[PDB]
Amino acid sequence: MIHSLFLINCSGDIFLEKHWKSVVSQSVCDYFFEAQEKAADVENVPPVISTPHHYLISIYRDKLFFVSVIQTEVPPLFVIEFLHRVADTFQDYFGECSEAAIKDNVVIVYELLEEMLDNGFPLA
Amino acid sequence: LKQMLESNKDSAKLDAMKRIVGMIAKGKNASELFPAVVKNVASKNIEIKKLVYVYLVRYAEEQQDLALLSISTFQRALKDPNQLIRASALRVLSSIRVPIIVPIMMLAIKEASADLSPYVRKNAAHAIQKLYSLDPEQKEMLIEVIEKLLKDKSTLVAGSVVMAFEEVCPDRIDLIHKNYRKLCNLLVDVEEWGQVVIIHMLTRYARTQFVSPDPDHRLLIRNTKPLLQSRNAAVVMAVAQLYWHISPKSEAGIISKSLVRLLRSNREVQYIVLQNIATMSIQRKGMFEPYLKSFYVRSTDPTMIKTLKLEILTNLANEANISTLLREFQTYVKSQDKQFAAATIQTIGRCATNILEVTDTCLNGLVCLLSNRDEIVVAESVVVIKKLLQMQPAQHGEIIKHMAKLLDSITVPVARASILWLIGENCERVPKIAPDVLRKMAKSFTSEDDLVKLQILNLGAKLYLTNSKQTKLLTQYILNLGKYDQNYDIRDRTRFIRQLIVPNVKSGALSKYAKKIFLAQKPAPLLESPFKDRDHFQLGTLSHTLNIKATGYLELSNWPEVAPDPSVRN
Amino acid sequence: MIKAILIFNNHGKPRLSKFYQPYSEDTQQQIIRETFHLVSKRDENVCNFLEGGLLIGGSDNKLIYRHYATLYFVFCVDSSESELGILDLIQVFVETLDKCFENVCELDLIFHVDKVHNILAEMVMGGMVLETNMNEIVTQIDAQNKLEKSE
Amino acid sequence: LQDLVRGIRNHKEDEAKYISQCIDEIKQELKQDNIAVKANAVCKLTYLQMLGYDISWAAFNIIEVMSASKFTFKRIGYLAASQSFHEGTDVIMLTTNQIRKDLSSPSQYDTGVALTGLSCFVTPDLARDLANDIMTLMSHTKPYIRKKAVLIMYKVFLKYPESLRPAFPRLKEKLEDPDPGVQSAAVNVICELARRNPKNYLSLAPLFFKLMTSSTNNWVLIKIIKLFGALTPLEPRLGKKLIEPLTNLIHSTSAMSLLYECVNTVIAVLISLSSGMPNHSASIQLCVQKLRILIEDSDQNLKYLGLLAMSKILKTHPKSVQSHKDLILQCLDDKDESIRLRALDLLYGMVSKKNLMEIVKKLMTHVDKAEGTTYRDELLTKIIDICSQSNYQYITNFEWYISILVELTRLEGTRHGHLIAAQMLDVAIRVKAIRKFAVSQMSALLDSAHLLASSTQRNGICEVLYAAAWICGEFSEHLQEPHHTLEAMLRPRVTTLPGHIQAVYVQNVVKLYASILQQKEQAGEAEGAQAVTQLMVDRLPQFVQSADLEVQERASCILQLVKHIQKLQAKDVPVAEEVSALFA
16 A cells, blocks of 8 residues: 655755665655645645656644655545554654654654555555 | 765664665665665664665666675575564565576565465565556465455454455455455454455445345454444545445435534545545435535535535535525625635536526526626526526527626626527527627628637527628628637538538528528426446545546446355355 | 855754854754755755755855755855865865764764863864864864863 | 763753753853862863853853963863854953963964864954954964964954954965965965955965975865866966866875866866867866766766766867766766766756657656656656757657657656647657657557546646647548547547646547548448437537536537527538638
8 A cells, every 4th residue: 555655854965864665766656746846735735636656645743744655556535544643653662753852763753654564555 | 875875884884875765765766776775684773774675675676687786685584583584585686687586586475475474464465456456366375365365353464465465366256255254354343444345345236246235244344334324434434435335325325414513524525535425415315415514515615515516516506495595695605715606506407407497596696697707607607597598598688688798797607608609599589689799700700719709600690691781791801700710619510501601502401501500499408416437436436536546446346236155155 | 155054964953053253043043944944955966055045044054964864064154155165165174073082973072062062162263274284183173172180 | 071962862852941950050160269070060061062052141250261271271262262252242252361362372282272263253342452462373383383374364364354464474474484384274275265255365376286296195286176177267367377286186185086187177268268269179078987987986986076076068068078977977876866867967968969869768768767756747848858958859750759658648647747738749840751650549549448548637648638639630531430439539438637737639520520431432432421410419518518617618619500400400511611610
């Protein structure tokens, strides 16, 4: 399902990257960045964004984007709810969902991403 | 960092691997460092094994040849006593795309699927995913493995097993045809993501293998019912999409309570829910009628969330509530959200078409609205009235005269075209201002937008056909200006329009008909909500959201005339 | 004319900040963050020449840097300084810390900041390149340590 | 100092509170009689300034630390003093007695720390008050004092020109200092003087020639050589005298950086000298060879600046640069985007009537390998720029050009779709012998417009579809399946494209109707003409119902017209000629 994750900061850079299967280039997020350029603010980006070979299912909370990569047809709410669940677990372990906490505990972030998602199907 | 890993100190290796994982998260290239990492894959420290396997999972497809050099190590890792190690080793083996790894991968998947630990079983389902993505020609024995997996009682495996079945063999319905009972009974206890996947597949299966509402067809509905209260948005939407596509129309309305409840959730959750509910409301209006007030726009929601709420309100408009909505639309028009303000202006016209009895009342809201100082509101207000004025081709002088005076202060290209178009149709109804409008635009033609230019030739021809006694020079002026325009579209129209109008020397039978075709009464536009196109798509799926058949769409069939043999399915 | 010397790790936490233009402390901090965000975003195979930001006096200046281990060594210079000249200056600088600190690391830049300012002053003086002969440089700092020992 | 380091490291989230407490403690400590505690607090406060806290509050305490007779506290005080006072700090005036005491002292290293402090004390008042003594310190006996002192001059010169007037001959005689470090520092100062008013140093060129003949320490040569590049605009003749030592240096260069600096500077020198003396092509050849040796090296910085120098000489002498070819084509694959963009500019530079095809083939292999809608956009824009420069001057096989345009059409997600469409239209109308291939390719894409319809965004694939529709309708005479192409263009899948695309689609569908009706009536196939007309009458209403303005207008008028044409055909009317004349 959810194929790769691209946490994106407020300024418009690739804050964090994770891949579960064959790696998609970071050039997949330029469509999202173009959408943000078209969007009035951070609240006007559609959760599902189409790319020529992938689909970007993204959520925005705690001043941070959770951009996931989708290749095959998937329930959009499946991926959106999974992103919000991973954000909730991020907040639970960190105590607050913030750029600095993730930047400091990248290793625990990767451990949590691997624990939550196993080869495309979220399960714990 | 290479020498740091080559050190016999395990803590040094751990620190180096943590740094490597960090720079991977940064996205930098660590493929050069693969020769050092592959050396300690057989280390006895569990943490270093986990980090090393993360690195191997990330860079196994990059440095494929060194992984080829160390396949036997992965073979030995497949027998590791700790389950996560077996899963990771099978994952790394599946990551290799060399056309030779195939039979080893096949034996690996067979052993994993036969092994007792459920975690490696779901990882083996993902392994057959990967192999089918790699070698499609093994699908017979892949399907055999899937048949073996689907019989497993564990739900943790069951979700991933269903997904593997579906992407590998979506057509071999018989395997799920056998364990319909097991899957439906486990659907209460299956984990939520597995619940979503199983519910989508069961909706497709029920659409294929049943006729109009069979005890088994009710068995799906009987056990899917308790999930409508689930906290997961995907689960409830999956159940709601199940009821819409499977349940009788007399019972499927029960989902409108839970679907509306989801609108209290986050922005992203309700963006899809509003998109689905918009399509549901078109075909069956009465189910969402009692919750009309729950779809009233709040100013806190963003433009795209509010706009979808507007589209639901349009589809729910009826003569018993059109007046209530029309008053509410007037509230939203002067909102500070210019993008949303345009949408509500569009909403009024759509409700005016749906409710034919309030066409005059809807106009009165808009014609007086034409005096607003906002440049965008007047831009779309004249567009929407144009549709309403087109629908009733009556001499609505109290409206059209207002626009013609306004046109001198309109800059938006679409709005300028709409004003020029209404003037062209009603040239005989306004024979005193229409000639001056063309004269105003002819001077400014060179600076107009490409879309606006087209309507001036349309205006220029229409005025010529009725009042050539005095606009013949104006028409020739504007046609000559468009003849040399940069965009070839205008050069195409000018070539066509001039040919139809000017050359009376070659006035054949078709040219004497020219006044008829341009001045022909324009049929009302069958304006369609941007959600009726979703009638061809399953609710709750990606293809429904994009309105395009996404790669791997699992198309629903039509209800079969006769039900396939229920006695086989036991 | 070296505008300022900025040294920080891969996390942006400062290790050295020596300015040769009168800038306020808040301006110095936002300058450090700006150069860190400009530099660390590029991977190892990217060139080491970034056009200067607006906080260091405009685009006339440039951000020249090198990466060792997890440390960044950025020199703010204008269009008049040699790109690889400043690069080699950084190289001699880092080697000077290596042998003055006996295999320097980030920890020495953290706990021995004053000695690192001393190294910079012996190497670069007020935006002027003072000494480039490495051996004489280390010899002079060692002599300074001798007079610390003697008194 | 390390105690505060440990406290800050432990107090990560509580940095503000712990720093405030430490600031209060530093306030208490800096008012003590013991200068050692004050110096420790000054170490703390220098760390504080690096962290980003105001240093100006304890300038007087820093002075008090500096006033200590022990040089151990003197160095810390001077460091914080260099980092402490600014132009608006009148508190620096209390430093004067200690500054004079340390400056007039004969001790070499105490004077060294004093000069290190003074390097940031450079104000017009302090410069005016201390230039008299530091001018005497110019010729101080011990070398190290002079070695820092000349830089302290450079500061004063910047701030006190009234000492610059008489001390300029002093620096001129300083240029011959026997101690290598001292002379090198003097050179650095004199170059940074010459960089501002280069006219007053052209007469000083022979001293610099003697310097570069005698100098061995590379950085000295780098600085003087860049300044030699600097004066070449003012006097090309010093470059004429200097090219021979330039060439000797490049042949003797062992440092890659110094090598780059010399080769770039000789590019500048030869640019200056080419004005009336076009006989330096041998020097040009050698500098291109040196640039090649520079760029082949694997370190990306060396390669980048070497490539920049080749770019400059391409503006200068591209006749030798054009031979690089494969070299630049390999440097195209580097992972840095900036070097790739510079390489693309070089490809633009050397694209010629002989090698445009090969360069574009490699560029399009890369664009297939390229990632990033921004990068993909600039790459395709550059491809169109190098193909379309001077009205398609350097392209001979236009069929290949249409082929590469169609290959670019595969780049779904491009924001330059309108540029591609304009290129296809321009090449189709401008050149006639390739209209057949253009029509064939575009009609093939129209048959696949059900696939190209996946991108309905503006400036996307829909503009490609617009170009296809225009050049098939206008040039329908070269079509092989006009009935098939008009059926494909009237397909219901079209009904989801933006306004003007559908509008031009319909306006050319009627053109195809004219052409096919002409063909069928000329051969006498009345039944086929009736079939085509009834097909269009059954398809245009699908577009008349559209809500967008111009497409609806076009569809409605054209549908009414086609109904009337059918009415005439029921009356046995040769309507084909007039329908063709509508679009002739």
